[PDB]
Every structure is written in structure tokens, then in C-alpha cells.
Design a protein around this ligand. Structure first.
Ligand SMILES: Cc1c2cc(F)cc1NS(=O)(=O)CCCCC[C@H]1CN(CCN1C(=O)CC1CC1)C2
Ligand SMILES: O=C(O)c1ccc(-c2nn(C(=O)c3c(Cl)cccc3Cl)c3cccc(F)c23)cc1
Length: 249
């Protein structure tokens, strides 16, 4: 069982491998393709074309990409050992709190620190590309957070274990089986620590974002998304109806 006490070196190393595999199979864009596309940057005309779009065109574009990013995180969560064995309540509690945070972490892979650009709809562009949204402060904070994560130079196994820990958090309010979540979290932390020690990457632990900075940024991001959704509702067919009901009712 993934929550079992006295987790062996076999269980811990398979947990590392299984989490990394779940991560790379739920990534919309492969890292090699994001790295290759770094030289493919939007021209002044294309940037002007994005700036001349209405607030509602840019909201619809952005909301569509975020809906897909979330759906991939739900698929990732469902591949995590023990997650599907939790009640629907506990699964919903972990995803409503953790899914956007995971999307925010995953964004660092599409961020280029050299020129401060992000991958958006085929090319790289700066934050000026999102001018029509009228969200420059929140967008600057998202760019700053991805900048800080990109300086860690995460390997696939590291970002995989880190995002799984963002999700399997026993402190999310509303959990019915809090003890079972503490056990799954304990084994993941053990796997994360074991992997960093084995690879001589423990230096990154003191460099990870402070406790609460990720929750705070996600809270501000979701609040803005909920305002746009109330003002100009996006019509989606929910892939996960019980989760969708909690976020949009
Ligand atoms: C595009 C992007 C940004 C930052 C970053 F680090 C990485 C990417 N690239 S990505 O991960 O491949 C794309 C995934 C969609 C994210 C859209 C998100 C962030 N972009 C600004 C618009 N935005 C909003 O939520 C606007 C809402 C508040 C009104 C900038
Ligand atoms: O398909 C499904 O069932 C589904 C279910 C939940 C969501 C979802 N949307 N969401 C937004 O912030 C959001 C809004 Cl408020 C408007 C537009 C775009 C987005 Cl991504 C979340 C935040 C945290 C956790 C979540 F699961 C979601 C998406 C899809």
C-alpha cells in the first residue's frame, strides 16, 4: 500500500519512478520542444496584434489554456499512488486547493529567464503581450515566481516530486481521512529527500519558495479568474463534473 509504514528502499525508489512517469505523461508540451522553440519569438507586429485584441478575446484565450493545464493536473493527481483510494470529498479538497498551484509551478518550464519571455500559442513573448487583460501586477508576480523557480534548474524527477507534494498536503481543510493523507505525504517526502540526497541535490531544499508564497499567489490568481468568469462566463464541458461543481457553484 502507498500509505504503508516502514516503506522500503524498493517502495521509495518505485514511488520516485512512478511519480516522474506520471508527470511526463501529463505534460502538454515536452521540455525538448519548449527549449527548441526559445528562438521562435513574436515580432512587434504580432505583439501589437495581441495588444489590439479585446479584454474578452484575451480572457477566452487564457481561460482555455488554464482549463487544459488544470485537466492535465487532475490526470496527474489520479495517477498518484493512493489518490483514487481517497473519498471523492478528499480528492476534491486536494484538487480545489492544489491544482492551480501545480499549474503555477509547471509554468516555469515555459518561462525563458534569458529574455524574460513565456511560451504562448506557438511562440515566446513578454508580459506586454497580455496588456489587453488589464492584469499587469498579477502577471508580473506570475513572471517573478516562474523566474525564481527557473533558477533552481529542476530535473524532471525533482519537479515531479515537488508538484506531487503540492497536491498530497494533509493540511488542506475539509479532509475526512486526514490520517491516510499524512501517511501518503510522509512517504512522498521520504522519496523526495532520498532522491535529492542520492543525486547530491539537497542544496535546492533551502532554495524552494517559502511556505505560503505559492498558496498566496494561487489565491490572487484564482480570485481574478473567478471575477472574469462571473463577468464573461466561459462555456466548457467539464471533464470532472464533481470538481467543476465545487469551483463554479
Ligand atoms: C503564458 C505563460 C505565462 C506565464 C508563465 F510563467 C508561463 C506561460 N506559458 S505556459 O505555461 O505555457 C501557458 C499556460 C497558460 C497561462 C496563462 C497565464 C500566464 N500567462 C499570462 C496569462 N495568464 C493568466 O492566467 C491571465 C489571467 C489572470 C488573468 C503568462
Ligand atoms: O473540466 C473540469 O471538470 C474542470 C474542473 C475545474 C477547473 C478549474 N478551473 N479553475 C479556474 O481557476 C478557472 C476559472 Cl475560475 C475560470 C476559467 C479557467 C479556469 Cl482554469 C480551477 C482552479 C482550481 C482548481 C480547479 F480544478 C479549477 C477546470 C476544469
Amino acid at each position: 500500500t502507498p500509505e504503508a509504514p516502514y516503506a522500503s528502499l524498493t517502495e521509495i525508489e518505485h514511488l520516485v519512478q512512478s511519480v516522474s512517469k506520471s508527470y511526463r505523461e501529463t505534460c502538454q508540451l515536452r521540455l525538448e520542444d519548449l527549449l527548441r522553440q526559445r528562438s521562435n519569438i513574436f515580432s512587434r507586429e504580432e505583439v501589437t496584434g495581441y495588444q489590439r485584441k479585446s479584454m474578452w478575446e484575451m480572457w477566452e484565450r487564457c481561460a482555455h489554456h488554464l482549463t487544459e493545464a488544470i485537466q492535465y493536473v487532475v490526470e496527474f493527481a489520479k495517477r498518484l499512488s493512493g489518490f483514487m483510494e481517497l473519498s471523492q470529498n478528499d480528492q476534491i479538497v486536494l484538487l480545489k486547493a492544489g491544482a492551480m498551484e501545480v499549474v503555477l509551478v509547471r509554468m516555469c518550464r515555459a518561462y525563458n529567464a534569458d529574455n524574460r519571455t513565456v511560451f504562448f500559442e506557438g511562440k515566446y513573448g513578454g508580459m506586454e503581450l497580455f496588456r489587453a487583460l488589464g492584469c499587469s501586477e498579477l502577471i508580473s508576480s506570475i513572471f517573478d515566481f516562474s523566474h525564481s523557480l527557473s533558477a533552481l534548474h529542476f530535473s524532471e524527477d525533482e519537479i515531479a516530486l515537488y508538484t506531487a507534494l503540492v497536491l498530497i498536503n494533509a493540511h488542506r481543510p475539509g479532509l475526512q481521512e486526514k490520517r491516510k493523507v499524512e501517511q501518503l505525504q510522509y512517504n512522498l517526502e521520504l522519496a523526495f529527500h532520498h532522491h535529492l540526497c542520492k543525486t547530491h541535490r539537497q542544496s535546492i531544499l533551502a532554495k524552494l519558495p517559502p511556505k505560503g508564497k505559492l498558496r498566496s499567489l494561487c489565491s490572487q490568481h484564482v480570485e481574478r479568474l473567478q471575477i472574469f468568469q462571473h463577468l464573461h462566463p466561459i462555456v466548457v464541458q467539464a471533464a470532472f463534473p464533481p470538481l467543476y461543481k465545487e469551483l463554479f457553484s
